[PDB]
Amino acid sequence: MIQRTPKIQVYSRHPAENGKSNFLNCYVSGFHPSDIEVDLLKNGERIEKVEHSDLSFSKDWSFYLLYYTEFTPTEKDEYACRVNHVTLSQPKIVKWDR
Ligand code: NA
Numbered sequence: 001m002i003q004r005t006p007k008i009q010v011y012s013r014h015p016a017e018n019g020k021s022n023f024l025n026c027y028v029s030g031f032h033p034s035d036i037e038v039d040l041l042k043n044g045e046r047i048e049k050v051e052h053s054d055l056s057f058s059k060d061w062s063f064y065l066l067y068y069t070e071f072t073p074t075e076k077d078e079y080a081c082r083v084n085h086v087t088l089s090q091p092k093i094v095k096w097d098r
Pocket of ligand 1: 090
């Protein structure tokens with residue numbers, strides 16, 4: 001058996017074909033086992049509608065998840081990604097910078 005704690009990165013991107021659109025992204029990387037729970041949060045509340053959840057693996061024991069959706073951030077709102085995995089004794093919450 002092998003188990004590996006996910007690396008978690010939270011960031012925003014504008015698709016170049018539609019620059020007015022903005023996406024909030026949580027990239028959860030290099031984890032094992034694949035069992036996982038991942039949410040985007042707005043002001044502590046789970047965002048229910050997340051349009052994209054893309055899972056892949058490299059080696060059989062290394063998984064990668066890109067979890068993202070369109071959003072409209074204001075200066076006041078706080079966004080975060082919350083991840084639960086067997087390697088994390090408590091949920092890990094990573095704040096979006098900006
Ligand atoms: Na856990």
